[PDB]
Design a binder for this molecule. Structure first.
Ligand SMILES: [Zn+2]
Lengths: 112, 27, 43, 96, 49, 111, 56, 103, 66, 313, 56
């Protein structure tokens, strides 16, 4: 579990790595992720609690990155649900690879 | 009276189909 | 019956609303591409 | 009290007036013409032109693409900016 | 005479009720309504020009 | 004799839209005899236009139907102008002709 | 394919896409057997995907 | 760090602020409160404090409708909540209450 | 200093929404019915916006009407 | 009536042409029935084959809505004017603008050509109208006068050369060479949006939301009052056959006997396939040279062509 | 586990906000979710099973 949570948290930290003064919400995100390093078991239990219960989340921001040809959707979530979802993802992919869920023909693959 | 105009005080300045039932119960 | 949002008609056929007697044609683009003269000069 | 100020735009240009010529369609011709006959015959010609012009033993699904002949959605013109087919195409193209 | 006061006698100004009230018909045509003529137009046009 | 220009065009179009509606309807709607809701009808205009920008259906509980069909008409016109402008600008940027700092962000917001 | 979609005028070659980046000798030739084999393929694939699910 | 429990003082001041400034300006309302952000103020308005929200017991019809719909569209609370006229969190709590008291 | 603006703004907001609330010879806010003292008028107002403050006005209402 | 007067055949809708993206505000027809032109909010001017109804040519160059369009008779020009402020002269020999007439302070609502002199007359929101020397691009005269926006202006050869009306509800008749008013008519209660001069009679008509008045020439004696159809009416147009057409903002169109005010037909026309019911009504309309076709410009972004019904009686 | 499923799904049902605009997404999947990838690839596996057919 610690392995997974660590990976996901690093991933989240990687978007802000250049780190200008950012903003308020982003500040909340860095402080909360930073919190997750100090007391991991807390974060893991809170996460599993969400996954067992909450069916209603908060509103996601949306904005368009401009490639000058086709626009790219961009979504913004509150940090709590981002850490929760992130761990959910590292875990899902891990179990998935262990159990050989995806046959080889699907190739945005880690190997190559 | 007819040409009373509601003041435009500014704020700046749902139904469902039953096919969902058939589908969901089917699954 | 069911219609995907891919189609889903809104508004009747163009022709239907006006009726049969009138001819309804949608000109888009154009013809006689511009280098042509409306009013052609004498020679 | 007229000012000695000038401007670039104002200066002479196209001082001659192009009068219409006889084959361009001088008013003389127009007065004499029977338009109605001309308009009818042209119309008829146009109409005529138009006339001239015209295993897998295993699968989930039997053919979906049976009678699906495109439909006249691009023949309909719609006077509504958000439901014009042009707008749909634009919206389709530029958002992801 | 109030209204004219500023202007010269020559320049017209409607004021009486009679002016307002309708006048009827005039037939299919009468010399009364017609476009000055060719020749009046030529004179006017030339002087104007 | 100031000449329409890029800086002034959006302001120009809305100026002469406010005038278009004003002359038309106050010469069209009337019999208020005193002043009929000119400030107010125009505030209904801007209100409706914001609502269509937010994609919020806009229904005023009381209102004369000629006033409502009015606003819906002109608002749809301005919507057609704004939208067509948006398409055109995305075509220009796509081809990479225009380099401007503002039209990119604006055009983005539109799409 | 020709059973459900006939082409008596051989119009299957009108809207077929080739890759024009390549030189002519490298670009794909246009022939009835070949083109129609192509559209028959693409059509066969498409009919295995219900339109409401996804499409091509 | 900003997150925390909602206070009667913060909640009443939120009432007054929303009354004065209007619904669409959140940054202005978050400016007055301490230890709360604009997102939190908005979602706190529309989730709970909003007077249009219905706080009371569920009638029999609302329970029939809620159960039927929840069996129709599993796990979708933001779709169902407007149909029954209740808050998503509220109808959630009531649903887990119906399965909780049902056995 | 930004903190100073909030104090000013939260007094005026509790003045608008405001007949019982006052300010003593000191700066504190007080409810003259309930004789309670409030740290901030808004904080005080909530007590002023509370259901207990409500009652004690009604009780004094009756107690006078008798 | 005189005696259940002048039987005219009804008209039917013949053809509908799409292909503007904005409201079509203006239709004009070329001197030889070859091509008819349209101005639009789209900012284009399009030229259409009268016969087939196919689009010949799209011009671009106005910055804002084109409001008014005239095709000169004696010279191969378009004139157009817009909400932009700009009045342009296009040489149809090259399909480009050769001159531009500068000087109104606001949108120009309307314009017209003197039939023999070579002078252009324009109306603007700024309450003036101008007489422009086509050849030198020069404000010959400025017609001060009305208190609101001038809407429709017509030009004639004989006496009162310039006939104009405005949103201030009063018509002034302008003596061209003086650039002063000879006659003020004040008999409409609401804005005068349209006027029209009768081909042969030496009379003229004006339309307001309330009703439509005919006038004697000169000096505008009152003559008749056609009452019937009440809308904000944007178009009045007349055939040599004495057929007067009234357009309107609510979509309605009525045909009138010029002589009597007998309103023989009422046409209410379907809005376009998409569209909305409210975007109905005809901004303007015109008659080909043969008097055999009536063309209308509509807010549903179409052009409709009406044809006189041959079975009729 | 059914819980994980109900979480993942229930997440795709939320409110999209941009300035003025708010709406509910009851149908399309949200790409920007952290775990959206796994949904995409799995669903894609399903449609693959359609295209290739189970035997092949
Ligand atoms: Zn108290």
């Amino acid at each position: 579990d610690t392995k997974l949570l660590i990976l996901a948290l690093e991933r989240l930290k990687e978007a802000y790595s250049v780190k200008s003064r950012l903003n308020q919400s982003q500040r909340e995100e860095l402080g909360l992720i930073e919190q997750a390093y100090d007391n991991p078991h807390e974060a893991l239990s809170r996460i599993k609690r969400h996954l067992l219960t909450q069916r209603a989340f908060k509103e996601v921001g949306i904005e368009f990155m401009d490639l000058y040809s086709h626009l790219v959707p961009v979504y913004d979530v509150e940090p709590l649900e981002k850490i929760t979802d992130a761990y959910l993802d590292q875990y899902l992919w891990y179990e998935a690879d262990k159990r050989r869920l995806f046959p080889p023909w699907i190739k945005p693959a880690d190997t190559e | 009276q007819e040409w009373k105009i509601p003041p435009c005080i500014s704020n700046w300045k749902v139904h469902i189909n039953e096919n969902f039932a058939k589908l969901a119960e089917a699954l | 019956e069911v219609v995907l949002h891919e189609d889903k008609k809104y508004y009747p056929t163009a022709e239907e609303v006006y009726g049969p007697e009138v001819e309804t044609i949608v000109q888009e683009e154009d013809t006689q591409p511009l280098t042509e003269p409306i009013i052609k000069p004498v020679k | 009290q007229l000012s000695k100020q000038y401007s670039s735009r104002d200066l002479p240009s196209h001082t001659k007036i192009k009068y219409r010529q006889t084959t361009q369609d001088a008013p003389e011709e127009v007065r004499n013409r029977d338009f109605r006959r001309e308009l009818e015959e042209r119309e008829r010609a146009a109409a005529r032109e138009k006339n001239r012009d015209r295993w897998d033993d295993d699968v989930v699904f039997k053919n979906c693409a049976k009678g699906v002949d495109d439909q006249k959605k691009d023949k309909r013109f719609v006077n509504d900016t958000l439901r014009s087919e042009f707008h749909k195409k634009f919206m389709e193209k530029y958002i992801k | 005479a109030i209204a004219r006061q500023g202007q010269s006698k020559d320049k017209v100004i409607y004021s009486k009720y009679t002016d307002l009230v309708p006048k009827e018909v005039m037939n299919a045509d009468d010399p009364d309504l017609q476009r000055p003529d060719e020749e009046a137009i030529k004179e006017i046009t030339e002087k104007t020009r | 004799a100031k000449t329409v220009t890029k800086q002034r065009v959006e302001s120009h179009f809305d100026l002469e839209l406010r005038a278009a509606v004003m002359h038309d309807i106050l010469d069209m709607m009337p019999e208020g005899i005193k002043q009929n809701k000119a400030r107010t009808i125009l505030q209904h205009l801007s209100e409706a236009w914001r609502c269509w920008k937010a994609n919020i259906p806009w229904k005023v509980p009381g209102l004369p139907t000629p006033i409502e069909n009015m606003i819906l008409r002109y608002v749809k016109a301005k919507a057609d102008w704004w939208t067509n402008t948006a398409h055109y600008n995305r075509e220009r940027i796509r081809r990479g002709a225009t380099v401007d700092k503002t039209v990119c962000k604006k055009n983005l917001g539109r799409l | 394919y020709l059973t459900e979609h006939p082409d008596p005028n051989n119009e299957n070659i009108v809207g077929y896409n080739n890759k024009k980046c390549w030189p002519r000798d490298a670009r794909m030739r246009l022939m009835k057997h070949d083109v129609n084999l192509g559209r028959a393929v693409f059509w066969d694939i498409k009919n295995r995907l219900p339109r409401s699910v996804t499409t091509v | 760090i900003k997150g925390g429990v909602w206070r009667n003082t913060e909640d009443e001041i939120l009432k007054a602020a929303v009354m004065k400034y209007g619904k669409n300006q959140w940054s202005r309302i978050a400016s007055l409160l301490h230890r709360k952000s604009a997102k939190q103020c908005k979602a706190r308005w529309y989730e709970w404090l909003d007077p249009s929200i219905k706080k009371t017991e569920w009638s029999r019809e609302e329970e029939e409708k809620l159960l039927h719909l929840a069996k129709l569209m599993p796990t979708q609370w933001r779709t169902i909540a407007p149909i029954i006229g209740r808050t998503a969190a509220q109808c959630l709590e009531h649903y887990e209450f119906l399965l909780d008291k049902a056995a | 200093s930004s903190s100073e603006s909030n104090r000013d703004r939260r007094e005026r907001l509790r003045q608008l929404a405001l007949p019982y609330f006052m300010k003593n010879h000191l700066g504190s806010y007080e409810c003259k019915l309930c004789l309670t003292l409030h740290n901030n008028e808004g904080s005080y107002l909530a007590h002023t916006q509370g259901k207990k403050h409500q009652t004690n006005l009604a009780r004094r209402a009756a107690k006078e009407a008798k | 009536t005189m005696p259940k007067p002048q039987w005219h055949p009804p008209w039917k809708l013949y053809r509908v042409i799409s292909g503007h993206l904005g409201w079509v505000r203006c239709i004009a027809v070329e001197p030889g029935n070859q091509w008819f032109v349209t101005g639009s909010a789209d900012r284009t001017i399009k030229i259409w084959d009268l016969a087939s109804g196919k689009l010949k040519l799209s011009l671009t160059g106005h910055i804002s809505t084109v409001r008014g369009v005239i095709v000169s008779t004696r010279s191969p020009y378009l004139f157009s004017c817009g909400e932009d402020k700009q009045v342009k002269c296009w040489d149809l020999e090259y399909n480009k603008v050769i001159r531009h007439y500068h000087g109104h302070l606001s949108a120009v609502y309307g314009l017209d050509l003197h039939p023999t002199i070579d002078v252009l007359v324009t109306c603007s929101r700024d309450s003036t109208a101008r007489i422009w020397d086509v050849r030198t691009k020069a404000s010959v005269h400025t017609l001060s006068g009305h208190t609101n926006a001038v809407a429709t202006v017509r030009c004639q050869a004989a006496e009162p050369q310039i006939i104009t009306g405005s949103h201030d509800t009063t018509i002034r008749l302008w003596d061209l060479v003086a650039g002063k008013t000879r006659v003020t008519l004040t008999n409409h209660k609401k804005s005068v949006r349209a006027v029209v001069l009768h081909p042969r009679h030496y009379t003229f008509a004006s339309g307001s939301p309330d009703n439509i008045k005919q006038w004697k020439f000169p000096d505008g004696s009152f003559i008749q009052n056609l009452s019937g159809h009440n809308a904000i009416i944007n178009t009045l147009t007349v055939n040599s056959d004495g057929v007067l057409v009234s357009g309107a903002d609510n979509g309605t169109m009525h045909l009138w006997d010029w002589r009597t005010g007998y309103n023989f037909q009422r046409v209410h026309a379907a809005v376009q396939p998409g569209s909305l019911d409210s975007e109905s009504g005809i901004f303007a309309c015109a008659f080909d040279q043969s008097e055999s076709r009536l063309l209308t410009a509509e807010a549903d972004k179409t052009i409709k062509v009406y044809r006189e019904d041959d079975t009729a009686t | 586990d059914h819980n994980i499923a109900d979480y993942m799904t229930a997440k795709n049902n939320v409110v999209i906000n941009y300035k003025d605009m708010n709406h509910t997404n009851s149908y399309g999947i949200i790409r920007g979710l952290q775990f959206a990838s796994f949904i995409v690839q799995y669903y894609g596996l399903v449609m693959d099973l359609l295209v290739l057919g189970l035997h092949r």
